[PDB]
Design an enzyme around this catalytic site. Structure first.
Site, PDB file in Angstrom:
ATOM      1  N   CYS A  20     -29.681 113.814  -2.295  1.00 38.92           N
ATOM      2  CA  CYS A  20     -30.328 112.617  -2.819  1.00 38.92           C
ATOM      3  C   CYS A  20     -29.797 111.345  -2.123  1.00 38.92           C
ATOM      4  O   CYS A  20     -30.581 110.507  -1.672  1.00 38.92           O
ATOM      5  CB  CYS A  20     -30.113 112.524  -4.331  1.00 38.92           C
ATOM      6  N   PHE A  21     -28.468 111.231  -2.035  1.00 43.11           N
ATOM      7  CA  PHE A  21     -27.775 110.031  -1.520  1.00 43.11           C
ATOM      8  C   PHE A  21     -28.053 109.682  -0.050  1.00 43.11           C
ATOM      9  O   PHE A  21     -28.136 108.501   0.307  1.00 43.11           O
ATOM     10  CB  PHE A  21     -26.256 110.148  -1.726  1.00 43.11           C
ATOM     11  N   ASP A 129     -12.986 112.489  -9.190  1.00 48.34           N
ATOM     12  CA  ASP A 129     -13.623 113.695  -8.703  1.00 48.34           C
ATOM     13  C   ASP A 129     -12.718 114.531  -7.763  1.00 48.34           C
ATOM     14  O   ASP A 129     -13.169 115.076  -6.744  1.00 48.34           O
ATOM     15  CB  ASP A 129     -14.910 113.266  -8.025  1.00 48.34           C
TER      16      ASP A 129
END
Ligand SMILES: *[C@@H](c1c(-c2ccc(Cl)cc2)c2c(N)ncnc2n1CCOC)[C@H](C#N)C(=O)NC(C)C
EC number: 2.7.10.2
Length: 258
Positions: A20-21, A129
């Site tokens: 997506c990014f 993360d």
């Protein structure tokens, strides 16, 4: 902004990532120097949104965080960093390269990420993360921290109450230590996410992985304390992992898988 550079200076040879990014590639910078480059699809991610993580990579500099080189802050945006030859740490452990890793190299890797995170600690940032798929490996098994913008890796106080601290990172670093010792298998083998929250909350912690020294499983267990503040620092972990084989496990003998 001295980080800014011109466009004709980037050749984008090989395509590594996408989603997506946007994409990320291997390239060159001013004809000679080998770089990694990360791109933006303007449709999904917004212009001021994608920039986010690059402002953060400007204010940080350490031998164990992937290094920013240059930025193209006009659409389509490009972010330029050093090229980590050997890919994500997760692929490395899973693949035909990582079947021959033993404890001494695996602990050295853990110590390097611990170094980089102890720098994040000193600088008052939080990663959020931290796990093996966002660690990049280079030549000579150099490991570096990669993502700057998933319940099996997140501490419960963070996953439930949004409380993300450097202590929630220490929790994840503990799970990362199981990825290193199981050749990158998924933590909590057999359990789905909803079942992991319940179990963890009710005191369940992963057992000592086969052939893992108990002193290293104790360390993971310190990182996974219900109480954020009774988890160790990255300064402590670094120092512990660095001296592992003199101070803690001088008896260490190699085995079949560790
Ligand atoms: C793709 C990527 C990068 C990378 C990381 C950070 C930044 Cl700012 C730019 C590029 C890599 C580097 N630096 N060196 C070597 N390989 C790199 N890859 C990994 C390739 O993954 C198949 C990046 C990551 N990690 C990525 O895919 N991220 C997006 C957000 C999906």
């Amino acid at each position: 902004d001295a980080w800014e550079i011109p466009r004709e200076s980037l050749r984008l040879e090989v395509k590594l990532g996408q989603g997506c990014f946007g994409e990320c590639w291997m390239g060159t910078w001013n004809g000679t120097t080998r770089v990694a480059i990360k791109t933006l699809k303007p449709g999904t991610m917004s212009p001021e949104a994608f920039l986010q993580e690059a402002q953060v990579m400007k204010k940080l500099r350490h031998e164990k965080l992937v290094q920013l080189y240059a930025v193209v802050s006009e659409e389509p945006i490009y972010i330029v960093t050093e090229y980590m030859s050997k890919g994500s740490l997760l692929d490395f452990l899973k693949g035909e390269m990582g079947k021959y890793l033993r404890l001494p190299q695996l602990v050295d890797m853990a110590a390097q990420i611990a170094s980089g995170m102890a720098y994040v600690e000193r600088m008052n940032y939080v990663h959020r993360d931290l796990r093996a798929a966002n660690i990049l490996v280079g030549e000579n098994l150099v490991c570096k921290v990669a993502d700057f913008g998933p319940i099996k890796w997140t501490a419960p106080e963070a996953a439930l109450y949004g409380r993300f601290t450097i202590k929630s990172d220490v929790w994840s670093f503990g799970i990362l230590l199981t990825e290193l010792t199981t050749k990158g298998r998924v933590p909590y083998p057999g359990m789905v996410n909803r079942e992991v929250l319940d179990q963890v909350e009710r005191g369940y912690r992963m057992p000592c992985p086969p052939e893992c020294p108990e002193s290293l499983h104790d360390l993971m267990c310190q990182c996974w304390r219900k109480d954020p503040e009774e988890r160790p620092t990255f300064e402590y972990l670094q120092a512990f992992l660095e001296d592992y084989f003199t101070s803690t496990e001088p008896q260490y003998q190699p085995g079949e898988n560790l």
